[PDB]
Each structure stands twice: as structure tokens, then as C-alpha cells.
Design a protein around this nucleic acid. Structure first.
Lengths: 50, 65, 72, 101, 91, 247
RNA sequence: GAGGCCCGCCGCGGUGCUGACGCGCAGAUCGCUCGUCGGAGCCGGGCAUGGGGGCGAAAGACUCAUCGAACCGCCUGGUAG
RNA sequence: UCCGCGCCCCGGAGGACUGAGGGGGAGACGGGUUCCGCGGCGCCUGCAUCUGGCCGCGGGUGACUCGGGCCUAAGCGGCGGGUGAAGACCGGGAAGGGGCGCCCGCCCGUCGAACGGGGAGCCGGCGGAGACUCCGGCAGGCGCGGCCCCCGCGGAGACGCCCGCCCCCCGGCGACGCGCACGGGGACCGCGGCGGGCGGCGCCCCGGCCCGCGAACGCCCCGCAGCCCCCGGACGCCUUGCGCGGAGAGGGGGGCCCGGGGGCGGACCGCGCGUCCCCGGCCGCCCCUGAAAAGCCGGGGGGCGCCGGCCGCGCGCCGUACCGACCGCAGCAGGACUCCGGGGUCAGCAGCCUCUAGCGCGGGAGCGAACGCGGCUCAGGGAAGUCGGCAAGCCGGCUCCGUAACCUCGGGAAAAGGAGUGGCUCUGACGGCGCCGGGUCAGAACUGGAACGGACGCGGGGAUCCCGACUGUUUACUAGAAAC
């Protein structure tokens, strides 16, 4: 893992970049009501690349 | 360790290892053989002892004489 | 680093070869018999330990105006 | 009271090229300096005896004068081997002439 | 001296194991394998086994092919003679 | 049933020879114009050990006839050959141990080894430790020479076929008892996965034809016909006779 | 200073208590007591071998909690007096 | 545990634990942001929480020298083609490489290893999070240019000395097993001394504790063993064990290599016993013989002109946080590869205590019922208990006696069975001599509720009979066996 490859690191960094909650202004604009991304992953309970 | 040097704590009850373990009967041989081979060699170089005697004495020293 | 050959080679290097700086580090830790001259070159830093301050002066004499001195 | 140290190499596995020597640094700490495996000097092609005069350093970092022996077939043949080769060659030519004469 | 009275001279290592027949056979082969043989060149009793069939004289620095456990095998000694007699006869 | 061990062995895969670290293929020097007329002189650079062979091998360096370098041959070593020997491979070669000459040239009664089954085969018969073949007779009209193979069987081979004079070295290697299972594991590790061996009467009915019942018994006779099927030939194949006997 | 030698640590196994546990700490763990501990040894990485096939110091054992024939999808909403 | 906002948080004081095969410091892999700072408790933290690996916000991984990349390994793929209904599978025999005039030339791996091989990194510092990467010094490697210079000498020899390149040939280095010993270094350790800083002190104390630093690299000098040279011609020379010598010993003088030591530059003084790691010369071992290549460098022959020195510059690509965070539904007495390893007692890296470092686990209070689990002791008897000594207990360290049948002569054997063991005060031994440095082996007195392997660690033994010779292997998760 500390000896990773750029192509494994860049697909893992997309997940870190997109593990975000819906911006609050987006909920207000769309009247979303459901404010949970649901594609968000927590390292301990998750198995990305599996 | 100052008592041990005097000879205070080294009796049979305070020994938990075999005599060979406490002092290797091999390292006592190397020392004696080296000490005696040094003595005989110096005598031969000094011309105190003959070359032939040196060989005879060298063998008897190797033979635990 | 190396020790320069007396001031024989030291002054020869000082005259032409890289002598970016010389340092007259006298009193290294306030100790006696201590004038250490440290010539910076491209290849190596060279040090000649000289017995006396007067001995050091003869080598400092002839130091190029272009050659830079620093004193410790 | 602890002089335990940590690995200098990329991985802890201690192989032949992964051996360290501990020295104390100026800042009073034990440091692990790497121990390079000694390359070995050239050995005579005929026979197997190490050629005298050539240091056990990788040949690239040696200097041409150091990596050579001043003798015909110097870093290849040891002197005893070379003198046997010279003698064998000379004698063969001398026996051939005797066969013709 | 004579630390082992019987022919357990080199086979003392095996201890009470492998049976008498194996140990007796090993006595002959083992004693032959670790023996010093006379090099046909050095003429010095310095030939010792390196591997099965390979024997080297430490002084002569010459390696020679031989029997697995002896520098020279009885079949080989006879063959060299037969080849010599036939060679001399052909010329 | 299950495929038996013999069937599983022919796909290699674990039963393939452990050929790593083996010096090379031991073979007689190739027949060349200088071998066919006259003799090529080689020097025995080394006598070494092959990983899976009991007999010592030998690196003999011959001159390159084709070009300008020196060519190295690997030969099974006859006993008595030494480093720095001069070995001649040729039609005009003297009868000394080590030399390779055509079998017609070799005289009758001569111990020979690494004999060629057919001319220019570079080695075939008499290659194991101690083994040798003997020249029995030459028919000069049929250009054929009778030899006795180490088995005893007599083979008529072409007089052109070459052989190395001498008896292969390593002689008397099997006289020493292996003594321990461990010594066997070390010998077989340098060869192939054939050891340890489980008897078929030990295996369950699926694994072997001898298979298994309430008591360990071969069931039907161990003797099997030569025309058995590939998974059925397991005991004594085509036995002319069985049993211990005189002679 | 020899040994598929002995005692014994780690290691690697797993004997007995038929101990604890048995809604477990755990879909096999725990504690003692043990077998061995220079060797047919133990351990990592890479690689090879594939389903009636493999591999097996052989127990029908093992092949990803699955083996007297793995698993996944389909034929298949198989057929059942 | 006490006090301090007082929370299981944090700070101080205590009392402890993991106990150098660590509840320590670090990596490989796997996770993939868990890392850091700030705020927060709604989720989660199986009790709580002001805590957090949780939640929100903002950040964090810097390399010519470390690793990848490159080489080859087991292997795998490729190949005019060869098959097969195909999908696909199989594979050397096939006009297989380059510039200009030529010449030389059978025939694939820019596959495969973050442990194997490889050109070269050290010190000191800095940050909330990182470092062989930053920064400051000091060096080493490999190339690109400018300038200058310029094509071998010395020796009796082994060598020495700053030295050319290309082709083709030949060789070397890369490059190698396991072991018991023995030697030499490094680190560690301990002992004194001196210098600095403490703590305790009812009595003693120069008796306790903490600190006292020196890297890569560059020159010069040494360096055992080994291997050679020159004279010369022999019972000697030597190890721990060996081994060695008319194919040349000893002796005398030399050469080489030696992962090392010193001196200077970089930049506190002495001594000892061990331990650990490297290294050396051996000796043993094998039906076991302990990889390869890239690369680099000699040598012979031909060609042919280099060579150096000095001074600048350059060095691209990717990995680089953290892990008590991995995998078992989980923040699960389960697994999971390494590296480095202080003190005392000890034969010990065992057990038991400890320095460093870490740190008090899905909570706490009472009470002291039965019963259960983990232990402890038991009068007299001593297996009468039970399917069966199951379980428990006896035994055990060391020294010195003593030891049977049987035997494959190696065993049995630690057979069996006795006796001693502490503390003090000494006395010899043994190397050490300018006498200085050892900590074991004996022997002796005097002691003491009739104690002493005082904890700890640590065989109960014998007589047979049946199997299987043996060491090994086996049913992961009911059979370790006489089975294999």
C-alpha cells in the first residue's frame, strides 16, 4: 500500500474526492428533502475495490 | 559481585548449571595449550631448548602431560 | 573534505583554482595552536592547520582581493 | 537506556544486501550504516587463484592502472600459470622440429 | 582409546538404530569415502572425495573421476589393463 | 473411479523432472569432418557434478574447427579421466580412456561407455554410474559391430557409431545403503516427485485397481496382460514368470 | 565434535482433562497438561496443476466455513403413485 | 486512587502493569484518509464521555544517491507455421538482424522478484501533520560541453606506479550451501577514575541515580590468517582441532588481498567479561553439491588514436500520511510476514522481578448465601475409589559416589539407589610480572528453632506382556493409532 501504483492510487483518490455530502444550497435549490448522498462510504464498514 | 570475588556466593547450592556450562572445559584447554606452546616456542627461539626436545615437549603438552 | 598540502598546494589553488572562500578559523573552541584555514573549492573543502597566528598571516598575505576571507 | 534502532532498508527482510553496521553519530544516536557485499578480485582463469595486485572493489570504481597488472596476460593468468604456458608453447615447437629432423 | 570396542568405529553416530547389517556395510563405505587416497600425480596420500565420483588431491590440485566411495574401483582397474593390453596389441 | 497416480504422472505438472541447476545435456562431441578424418584434441577443463546424475560429468574444451574460438563439450566422465587430460575424438584416435573413436576402430573386448545407438546420435547407451558396454565382434562386410549392453542384451550397431573408451565413473554408488528415509528424500528431490510411494492396497477402491477391502489384499492376480488398458496396467505387466528362484 | 541423538525456549503441532465454553470471545476458541524443537524441519513471496479433474507419507483426506465429486448461472416453475 | 472545570478527558501526585519472541520502536502486505490542526456530541464509542480511529471544517506524502522502473529465476507469453466444426490450442526449422561503399549475422522476449542481482548518501537542523526526499553543511555516482595537455616507465621477481578506444576471440566480477568450534573487528554491556547535574539522609554513605557526543566521505599509515616472490637446501614448522614441506619446509628479507583499525581533515581517560552482528582461516558433511542474467572490467590478436586534468551544467518517470485502522457480519481471548533487542538472578533469549518506551481493555458500586469456575490446605489410612490411578500428588537444579538383567555392543542409564548444598571468615590453584588481570574450580574453620535447588525453574521409579523397528505422516472442525 505505501508502495502503490499511480493507476490504483488515482481510482482510490476519486472515492476520497467524491465521499462528500450534498451541498446545503443544492438541497435548497432542488427541494431535495432527502439530504443523504447514499453513495458515501466509511472506510471501516466499506470494501472498495472488492 | 564484590562478595563473589572474595568467594562468598559460589557454593554448590548457588550453582544451577553443569560445571562445563559454568566454565567450558574446552576454553580451559585452549588457554593451557596456548600458554604452554608460547612458553616452549620462546625457549626454542632463545636456544634454551633444542629443536628435537621442543617437538618432544610439544607433543607431551598436547597429550595433557 | 581533505587536508591541503602545507600552504604549498593551498596557495597554488588560491592563486587560480576554485577558492570560493577561505576561513581563518582561529580559536576553534578557544584552543591554542589553532589557526585552521578552510579553502572552499568545487571538488573539496581543504583545511591546513597552522601552528601560529603569525604563520597564518604569511598565508593570509597574498590572499586575493577576489578570494573572500571570513574569520571565526 | 534504549539503543534499539529501526530499519534503514525499504523492507525489513534481512538478506545478504540488507546488513547494517551500528555507529554512534555526532548527535549521540546509534545509526545503521549499510554494509556493501565485498565484490571479490579477479581469479586466474587457468587454476583458480585470486590475481595479485587488483583490489576487491567493483571494477568500474577502480582506475585503469589499479585494475591492471603490468605483465602479459596479467589479470587473466597468474605468473606461475603464465610461465607454464610460455614453457609449454616453446617446448612444443622444439619437439616438432626434432620430429622433422 | 579404542573408544568403540566393536566395529561401531564410524557408525557410533547411528547409535542403536538401522540394524547391524546396514551399520556393517556403512563401516566399509564410510571409511572408504573419508579415507585419503594417493594421487597418481602428486604421489601423496592427499586425494579426498568432493562429491560421488569426484576426488581432488589437496597438494596436486588435480580433480580426477573415480568410484563413488573409492578413488579407484576394481572394475575400472581391470578395464584400464584390458584397454592397455588391447592398445599395445593393436600397435 | 479416479485417475491413478501413473495417469496423473504423464501430464507432468509436479512430476516433471527437477531440471533446475543441471549442468546441461551430456552428449558425445558432434561428428565433424576432422572427427571423420583424423582426431580433434580437447583438454578436460573440469570434472563436476550433475544435480540428478550420480556419475560425474566433465567439461572438455575442443578447438572450434568451424571458426576461431574454443568450443566446450559436456561428457559423462569415464573413471580415471583428470583435469588437464588431452582427450582425442577422431577416427584416428589412440585407445586411451576418454578418447572417442568409432566402434569399428575400437578392438573387441574393450570397455566402452556413452556408445551411440546409431551414428551421429551424440550419445545413448551406457551413460549411468559404473555402467559400460563391451565390443563383442565386428562384421566388416555389414559394417556392423555387436556390443553387449549393460543389461546383457547384444545389440548390432553400425561400426560408424562412436563410443568413449572406459567405464563410467561413480562406480559402486548403490552399494551403500540409503539407511534413512531422509537420504532418499534428498536423492529424489534432485530428480522428480516419485517418492514417497503409497502401496495401492493402502489406497481406497477409487484410487488404485488393487484398491481396498476389509483386509489389504491384491484381490485378483497382480499379473496383468500386455494389452491392458492405460489405467489398468498396475502390477506385474506381461510377466513371463514370477517368484524367487535359482539363477 | 558426529548424529532424520536426548532434555528444553520461541516456533510448529495438538495428547489427556473426555477441564472451561457450548444463547461462545470464537460456525472449533480457551486454560493447563503435552508431541517435537537441526530434521522427511518451520515460515513468507512468486509460480505450476481445475472438476468425474487436480493434488494426496492414503484419512475418500484436501481443493477459499462446500468434497464418497467444488462453486456460479442456466436447462428448471426437472419429476414425484 | 487523591486533588485540580474534574468525564473513562487532561494536568500533577501516588500505587502498579505490558517486562527487550514487549500492551516498545519500525517496515512488507491488506485497508484508503483512518494521518494533522480546529470545533462539535446529533450518530457511533455494547456504561458514561466534556473522549475518540465518530461528526463538521480546513489542511497533509517534496528523492541523481531509498525503493519501483532495469536484469534474469520458477514460470509465462510470442513465433512462417501445425491442428481443430470452431472457439481456441500447439510450436524453431522458417529469405528472422543496420548505416554507406561495404562488412558482420541461423533462430524472440522494454514478460516475470517494492525480499534475489543492481552506479552512488552521510551528518546536523526545521514543521501541527514528512524526511536517507525539505533546509544548512559535507560527499559520492553517471553523463553533457568549454579549455588545456598529450601517446608508458620502474623492479631480481611477486608487485609497484594515474591510467586509451573499437572489433573479434578467451576470461573475470556479478555469484552464492549447511554446521561445531576458533580467531579478529564493530555495536552493546559492565567496571573504575575524573568532570558536570541531582535525590534521599533516624544512623551509614567519596557505597545511590543522571549526563559526559563524533557520521558518510577524502588522503596517509598499519592489518592476523591466507596467497605469492627471492636466496637457499632440510625432521622440522605448527593448530583449539589440524595441517604443511625436495613439486622446496624452517630461517632471512619482501609483494598482494584483507566488508577492518588508527592519524589528520570532516568537526573525557583507562580496563575487562560476556552478548549480538559481520568477517576470516580452517575443519567436517552429502547416492543433498547449494540460480541466472543485465551490467561492469581485464587478456590475446588485429586495427587505431587516444588518455587524462581543470571548470561549469544536468539528472526526466512513479511510490513516499498513517495503521492496536488487515481478514474473520463487529473497535471479535481467532488468525496475520519481518527488522532491532538493556539490567539482576540464572547454563540460559527459560521462569520471576526491573531501566527505557508504552500504558491502565462492552462500565461501575455494594455484599461476602448456596452453587459453579480458577486455586489452597487437610488428622488417621493410603486406590479400599473407578471401566481404568482419570484427576491430583510424589519426583526434579547441581556436585560426588554408585548402578542390574538384557543388547543389534552403539545402548539400557538420569537405570535403581545413596550423600552434600545457606551465610560469613579465609586458604590454595590458574594465566597474568613494569606484576597486573580474571571468576571459576577445590579445601578449610565459625555459625543457625535440625536451615539452604528456601521463590522460580525443574524425570516419580521398577517388573512385564501385545503391536509397530526407528525419526517422521494422517483424518482443518469427534479416531495421532497398532493405520500411512
Amino acid at each position: 500500500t505505501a508502495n502503490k501504483t499511480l493507476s490504483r492510487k488515482l481510482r482510490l483518490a476519486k472515492k476520497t474526492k467524491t465521499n462528500k455530502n450534498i451541498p446545503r444550497w443544492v438541497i435548497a435549490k432542488d427541494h431535495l428533502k432527502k439530504t443523504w448522498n447514499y453513495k458515501r462510504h466509511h472506510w471501516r464498514r466499506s470494501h472498495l475495490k472488492l | 559481585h564484590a562478595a563473589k570475588r572474595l568467594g562468598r556466593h559460589s557454593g554448590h547450592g548457588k550453582r544451577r548449571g553443569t560445571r562445563e556450562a559454568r566454565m567450558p572445559s574446552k576454553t580451559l584447554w585452549i588457554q593451557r595449550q596456548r600458554v604452554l606452546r608460547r612458553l616452549l616456542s620462546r625457549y626454542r627461539d632463545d636456544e634454551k631448548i633444542d629443536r628435537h626436545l621442543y617437538e618432544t615437549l610439544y607433543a607431551k603438552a598436547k597429550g595433557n602431560m | 573534505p581533505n587536508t591541503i598540502t602545507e600552504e604549498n598546494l593551498m596557495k597554488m589553488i588560491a592563486d587560480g583554482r576554485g577558492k570560493k572562500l577561505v576561513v581563518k578559523s582561529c580559536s576553534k573552541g578557544r584552543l591554542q595552536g589553532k589557526v585552521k584555514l578552510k579553502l572552499r573549492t568545487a571538488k573539496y573543502l581543504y583545511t591546513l592547520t597552522v601552528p601560529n597566528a603569525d604563520d597564518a598571516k604569511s598565508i593570509v598575505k597574498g590572499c586575493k582581493d577576489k578570494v573572500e576571507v571570513q574569520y571565526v | 537506556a534504549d539503543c534499539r534502532v529501526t530499519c534503514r532498508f525499504h523492507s525489513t527482510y534481512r538478506t545478504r544486501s540488507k546488513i547494517v553496521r551500528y555507529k554512534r553519530t555526532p548527535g549521540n544516536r546509534l545509526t545503521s550504516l549499510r554494509v556493501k557485499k565485498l565484490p571479490n578480485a579477479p581469479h586466474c582463469a587457468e587454476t583458480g587463484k585470486q590475481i595479485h595486485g587488483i583490489p576487491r572493489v567493483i571494477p568500474q570504481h577502480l582506475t585503469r592502472q589499479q585494475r591492471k597488472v603490468s605483465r602479459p596476460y596479467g589479470g587473466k593468468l597468474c605468473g606461475s600459470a603464465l610461465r607454464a604456458h610460455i614453457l609449454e608453447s616453446f617446448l612444443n615447437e622444439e619437439n616438432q622440429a626434432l620430429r622433422e629432423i | 582409546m579404542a573408544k568403540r570396542t566393536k566395529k561401531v568405529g564410524l557408525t557410533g553416530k547411528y547409535g542403536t538404530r538401522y540394524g547391524r547389517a546396514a551399520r556393517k556395510q556403512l563401516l566399509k563405505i564410510e571409511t572408504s569415502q573419508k579415507a585419503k587416497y594417493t594421487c597418481p600425480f602428486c604421489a601423496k596420500d592427499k586425494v579426498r572425495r568432493t562429491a560421488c565420483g569426484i576426488w581432488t588431491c589437496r597438494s596436486c590440485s588435480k580433480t580426477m573421476a573415480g568410484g563413488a566411495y573409492s578413488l579407484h574401483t576394481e572394475p575400472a582397474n581391470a578395464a584400464r589393463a584390458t584397454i592397455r593390453r588391447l592398445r599395445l596389441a593393436r600397435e | 473411479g479416479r485417475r491413478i497416480r501413473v495417469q496423473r504422472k504423464g501430464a507432468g505438472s509436479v512430476f516433471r523432472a527437477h531440471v533446475a541447476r543441471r549442468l546441461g545435456a551430456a552428449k558425445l562431441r558432434a561428428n565433424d569432418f576432422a572427427e571423420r578424418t583424423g582426431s580433434v584434441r580437447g583438454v578436460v577443463k573440469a570434472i563436476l557434478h550433475d544435480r540428478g546424475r550420480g556419475a560425474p560429468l566433465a567439461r572438455v574444451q575442443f578447438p572450434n574447427m568451424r571458426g576461431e574460438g574454443r568450443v566446450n563439450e559436456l561428457f559423462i566422465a569415464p573413471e580415471g579421466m583428470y583435469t588437464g587430460q588431452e582427450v582425442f575424438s577422431g577416427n584416428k584416435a589412440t585407445l586411451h580412456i576418454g578418447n572417442i573413436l568409432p566402434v569399428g576402430n575400437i578392438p573387441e573386448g574393450t570397455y566402452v561407455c556413452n556408445v551411440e545407438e546409431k551414428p551421429m546420435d551424440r550419445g545413448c547407451l551406457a551413460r549411468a554410474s559404473g555402467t559400460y558396454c563391451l565390443v563383442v565382434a565386428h562384421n566388416m562386410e555389414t559394417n556392423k559391430t555387436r556390443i553387449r549392453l549393460p543389461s546383457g542384451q547384444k545389440k548390432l550397431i553400425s561400426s560408424k557409431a562412436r563410443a568413449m573408451i572406459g567405464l563410467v565413473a561413480g562406480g559402486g554408488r548403490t552399494d551403500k545403503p540409503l539407511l534413512k528415509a531422509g537420504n532418499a528424500y534428498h536423492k529424489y528431490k534432485a530428480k522428480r516427485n516419485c517418492w514417497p510411494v503409497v502401496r495401492g492396497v493402502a489406497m481406497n477402491p477409487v484410487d488404485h485397481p488393487h484398491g481396498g477391502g476389509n483386509h489389504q489384499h491384491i484381490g485378483v492376480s497382480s499379473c496383468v496382460p500386455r494389452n491392458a488398458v492405460p489405467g489398468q496396467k498396475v502390477g506385474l505387466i506381461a510377466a513371463r514368470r514370477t517368484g524367487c528362484s535359482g539363477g
